[PDB]
Amino acid sequence: MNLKVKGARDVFEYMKGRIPDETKEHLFVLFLSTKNQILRHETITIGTLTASLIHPREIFKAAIRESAHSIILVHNHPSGDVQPSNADKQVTSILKKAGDLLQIELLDHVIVGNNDWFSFRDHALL
């Protein structure tokens, strides 16, 4: 059971086969227990990532309902460069401080693509 998240790599592996259409951009939120066990995940956006499509209210209602301890954000890039856009970095800002507010910490934001992933935390970017 690879459902315990120790690092970004575990997120990458968990999301394998879970992108509905890899040509489309998708935002996902994984809900983690106090022991970093992936409880479940939800599809936030399906579309192109604008910060206005993010409604902290919805994301965290599911978090609070699942009594998630923390959350991890996953973005796929159809293209294949897992480097983050400024749209990605804006949604990271608003969910980081909404999680701090609500004490449901944004542990990481991981961008996934073909064979490859990018961790915001690992690039001192969270």
What domains sit in the chain, N to C, each tagged with a CATH number?
1-126 (3.40.140.10)
Q: Which residue has the tokens 């980081």?
A: 96
This PDB structure is determined at a resolution in Å of 2.3
Instruction: Report how far residue 53's alpha carbon sits from residue 58's, in angstroms, rounded to the nearest whole number.
Output: 11
Specify whether the CB–CB gap between 118 and 84 falls below 8 A: yes
Angle at which helices 86-102 and 56-65 pack, to 10 degrees?
A: 50
Helix (H) or strand (E) holding 38: strand 38-46
Residue 123 known to bind ligand: no
Residue 13: C-alpha distances to residues 8, 19, 23 (Å): 9, 12, 19
Single out the residue of 83, 90, 85, 109 nearest to residue 30, CA to CA: 109
Residue 26 known to bind ligand: no
Task: Dump the DSSP string for 73-108.
Answer: EEEE-SSS--SPPHHHHHHHHHHHHHHHHHT-EEEE
Residue 88 known to bind ligand: yes
Q: What is the experimental method?
A: X-ray
